[PDB]
């Protein structure tokens, strides 16, 4: 209403005039499904310039460092109405900042229905449930016999809204959540995603066993790229299509430009002799007419395969890739290091987005293409 | 137990439940002409089609039956067009089928991506693509436009995008005017309209008009859409409409006004303007001839500087001319610190 006869009641139901002259209000105020005590004494006239506002010690806790704000609000505010509008708006603010005190579940729906749906799955599956029961984690197997996990995060109403589903594998996971759908629904969807990659995981596990994988180290299930090493100081980075894994991947070569040339040239000759009946490795060995070494890691445990400018591996994602076109140096470097070296020196001469210069260690012509 | 399903079976098609593609006992031409001449020779020939479409509308009240009736026919002698498509090839049913097709479709606003993640709205609109006869454009129009008026964004966005396959040649210009009507009426859908107008068949005069009717409301447009807007302006630009749009363009553009997403699309706008002016000397020459003709005012703005640096960075034939213009400008006590 316009008047605070009716607008006071309509906005603050729980404010009851004790004294005849409507001068002491008392009782409660509502606030985010939370009612609180209040005892708000006015002077002999209706003036908020002078007013006593006493509280619950619970209310003093929630009006922490707004004691002055509300003291301002009392002296500058016209009516008691407007004061209460502000004191509500203000509580809502205080509590939404302190938003780490809230959230009781509905026990008749939740705890049981969750025990029911996990019974629907089976008890062998569950690996983790948080003491808030908010997170759980579940297990599935591939036809290969590989463990694939799924993390769920649950809301106050699990069956109503979608649970947040987190899972490693690289193609984006889609869960058709209805309020009728359950843990078993999303579990079947999870098995469907596992099998679409079933050939893909086998091709990747095959590469990871038989070849010197370099540049994912303990790869997740999310990795589609696999930097394999071959001989020493040349590498091949391999991105595979997860739906056609046995099929020909986009592959290319890092290292010394005199070593990469015949390999690229023989890949171009023999790329038609790729066949998706064999594995990725059993096609690459006959395409490039090579073998792969089995973890030159343990014998070459310190060959200093570090930048030899900055002496670190892993500068900001980058790898030692740029090398010397020389048998006697073979020293790897980084894009950033070799560029900040060859630009700094006099001798260095740049064509467009290339710098020709001298290798730091051996002073032979080395080329950098940004 | 409907005249619809009965006369379909008579004319030589198998109407299935709705779980796999419907079979077809005869040739599509044979089916269509037989159904035509069978409805002709039936007594109450003008009134059988009301009963026909009543039976059809009552049949297609289940989702899946209707969806299978919209899908490719199984050809026994091996895929073909849909049952509704082959019905639509029949002209006397056609306007009634349009009426029905347009009436029910707002049921499928919020049931998009049912079972095999297929959009029954896109299905029902793709029933109208490449139609070899159209009996009435204007009916079809006014209903398609009223649909467009109410419908949520992606649906209508898609209809817009599909309008070039749908409309016949008599009814291009018509649609044109009422799309310019929609343009002033909603901003959000500036982009697909534009794309549409440029993939229509129209008269160039009208396109000048609408292009000005872009330009006047170009302060009101969120930045994301500007690039393809201004790409459109600079493909609608003639050799002769050069300084006109450019002076207007050069005025109305602000680039003080826009400012984390803002900065990124400003950059992407500049990429797009680079590619424009990179890519026609028409603009570069006239652009400059439009900045030198602003040696008058001390008040020429950030854009004019940044734009110069740009044409020198990109365009090569002009390097002397930029330097000449910049030197005759800078000596004059124009461009300074501020």
């Amino acid at each position: 209403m316009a008047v605070t006869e009716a607008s006071l009641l309509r906005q603050c139901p729980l404010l009851l005039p004790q004294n005849r002259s409507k001068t002491v209000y008392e009782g409660f105020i509502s606030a985010q499904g939370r009612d609180f005590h209040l005892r708000i004494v006015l002077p002999e006239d209706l003036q908020l310039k002078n007013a006593r506002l006493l509280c619950s010690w619970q209310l003093r806790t929630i009006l922490s460092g707004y004691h002055r704000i509300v003291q301002q609000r009392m002296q500058h505010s016209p009516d008691l109405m407007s004061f209460m509008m502000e004191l509500k708006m203000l509580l809502e603010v205080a509590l939404k900042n302190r938003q780490e005190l809230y959230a009781l579940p509905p026990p008749p729906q939740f705890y049981s229905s969750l025990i029911e749906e996990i019974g629907t799955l089976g008890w062998d599956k569950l690996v983790y449930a948080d003491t808030c029961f908010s997170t759980i984690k579940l297990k599935a197997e591939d036809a290969s016999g590989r463990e694939h996990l799924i993390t769920l995060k649950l809301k106050a109403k699990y069956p109503a809204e979608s649970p947040d589903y987190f899972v490693d594998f690289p193609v984006p996971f889609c869960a058709s959540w209805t309020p009728q759908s359950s843990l078993i629904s999303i579990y079947s969807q999870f098995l469907a995603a596992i099998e679409s990659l079933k050939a893909f995981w086998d091709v990747m596990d095959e590469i990871d066993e038989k070849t010197w994988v370099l540049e994912p180290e303990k790869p997740p299930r999310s990795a589609t790229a696999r930097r394999i090493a071959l001989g020493n100081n040349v590498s091949i980075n391999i991105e595979v299509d997860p739906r056609h894994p046995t099929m020909l991947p986009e592959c290319f070569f890092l290292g010394a430009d005199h070593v990469v040339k015949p390999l690229g040239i023989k890949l171009s000759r023999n790329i038609h002799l790729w066949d998706p009946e064999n594995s990725v490795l059993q096609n690459l060995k006959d395409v490039l007419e090579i073998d792969f070494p089995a973890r030159a890691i343990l014998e070459k445990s310190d060959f200093t395969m570090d930048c030899g400018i900055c002496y670190a591996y892993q500068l900001d994602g980058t790898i030692p890739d740029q090398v010397c076109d020389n048998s006697q140096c073979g020293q790897p470097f980084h894009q950033i290091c070799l560029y900040e070296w060859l630009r700094g020196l006099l001798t260095s001469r740049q064509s467009f987005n290339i710098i020709f210069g001298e290798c730091p260690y051996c002073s032979k012509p080395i080329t950098l293409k940004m | 137990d409907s005249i619809f399903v009965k006369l379909l079976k008579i004319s030589g098609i198998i109407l299935k439940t709705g779980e796999s593609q419907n079979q077809l006992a005869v040739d599509q031409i044979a089916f269509q002409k037989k159904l035509f001449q069978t409805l002709r020779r039936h007594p109450s020939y003008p009134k059988i089609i009301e009963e026909f479409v009543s039976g059809l509308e009552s049949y297609i009240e289940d989702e899946d039956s209707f969806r299978n009736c919209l899908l490719s026919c199984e050809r026994l002698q091996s895929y073909s067009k849909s049952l509704i498509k082959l019905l639509l090839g029949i002209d006397i049913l056609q306007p009634a089928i349009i009426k029905t097709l347009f009436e029910k479709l707002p049921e499928y606003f919020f049931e998009n991506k049912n079972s095999d993640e297929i959009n029954i709205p896109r299905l029902i609109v793709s029933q109208l693509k490449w139609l070899d006869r159209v009996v009435d454009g204007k009916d079809l129009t006014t209903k398609i436009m009223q649909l467009i008026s109410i419908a949520p964004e992606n649906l209508q966005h898609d209809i817009i995008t599909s309008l070039p396959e749908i409309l016949g040649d008599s009814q291009h210009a018509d649609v044109g005017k009422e799309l310019s009507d929609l343009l002033i009426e909603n901003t959000s859908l500036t982009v697909p309209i534009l794309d549409v107008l440029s993939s229509l068949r129209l008269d160039p005069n009208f396109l000048l008009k609408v292009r000005q009717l872009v330009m006047d409301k170009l302060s009101s447009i969120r930045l994301e859409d500007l690039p393809v807007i201004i790409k459109f302006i600079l493909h609608s630009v003639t050799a002769m409409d050069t300084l006109e749009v450019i002076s207007e363009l050069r005025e109305k553009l602000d680039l003080q006004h826009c400012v984390s997403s803002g900065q990124s699309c400003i950059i992407l706008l500049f990429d797009v303007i680079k590619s424009a002016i990179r890519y026609e000397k028409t603009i570069s020459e006239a652009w400059i001839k439009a900045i030198e003709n602003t040696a008058s005012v001390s008040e020429h703005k950030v854009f004019d500087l940044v734009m110069l640096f740009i044409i020198y960075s990109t365009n090569t034939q002009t390097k002397k001319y930029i330097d000449r213009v910049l030197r005759n400008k800078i000596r004059s006590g124009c461009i300074q610190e501020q």
Binding site: - | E61, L105, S219, Q256
Partner: protein
């Protein structure tokens, strides 16, 4: 005319304030912290006295950015007095769709101060006659912002629903209800009661969209109200509406 005194610091910094606004046509100061010393009564003289109404598209926008930095939040009433000097002229005055700036400026401002913004301005924009496409498109953007949080779409509801319903209320309200804004059945029933009191294309689609999202909230009695409300044969898409209705039964 009224004999009101601005706070003496504002009468003092009244020309520094007039400087600063002018500056914003070419991080905030303390001069903007002196608005906390204005009551909405004094503030009302002050809005008129700063002549905020004539600020540029550019000039207003930068400004709005400053008020949104302010640390003690502006009081409900004070925040509202502002709105009406800042925007409401330009909003009412709108002829062609608001500058990306006023959309942005309004929407951004609306984002913090949405209840004061929308509690003030929505009513008059709509309780103005000759409200056209130009006016509606920003209250469209108001409701459609991510920033307009559920809680605030609910508070928008308490406001959209208290107004006289015409075509202009419905179109905006469909787009608020398009989210699945939460409802106490108290308000849903009133929405349905109110909905159920009618020939209009807008209203057709409104009813339709309610009955798909708040099917869940449709009682037997509300479905009777919808049977009443669909009675019309002016209703376009009736087959749809009654198919959806019959589908609840």
């Amino acid at each position: 005319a009224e004999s009101l005194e601005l706070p003496k610091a504002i009468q003092d910094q009244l020309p520094r304030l007039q400087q600063l606004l002018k500056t914003l046509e070419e991080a905030p100061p303390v001069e903007l912290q002196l608005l906390h010393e204005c009551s909405p009564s004094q503030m009302d003289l002050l809005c008129a006295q700063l002549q905020l109404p004539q600020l540029s598209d550019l000039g207003l926008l930068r400004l709005c950015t400053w008020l949104l930095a302010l640390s003690p939040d502006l009081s409900l009433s004070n925040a509202t007095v502002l709105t009406r000097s800042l925007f409401l002229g330009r909003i009412l005055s709108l002829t062609s769709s608001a500058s990306r700036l006023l959309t942005t400026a309004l929407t951004s401002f609306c984002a913090k101060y949405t209840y004061p913004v929308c509690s003030a301005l929505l009513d008059p924009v709509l309780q103005a006659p000759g409200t056209g496409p130009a006016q509606t498109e920003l209250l469209c953007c108001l409701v459609k912002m991510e920033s307009l949080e559920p809680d605030a779409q609910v508070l928008m509801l308490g406001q959209i629903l208290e107004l006289p319903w015409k075509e202009e209320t419905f179109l905006v309200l469909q787009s608020l209800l398009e989210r699945q804004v939460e409802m106490t059945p108290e308000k849903f029933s009133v929405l349905m009661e109110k909905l159920c009191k009618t020939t209009s294309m807008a209203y057709a689609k409104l009813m339709l969209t309610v009955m798909t999202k708040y099917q869940a909230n449709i009682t037997e009695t509300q479905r009777l109200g919808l049977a009443m409300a669909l009675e019309p044969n002016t209703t376009f898409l009736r087959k749809s509406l009654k198919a959806a209705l019959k589908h609840l039964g």
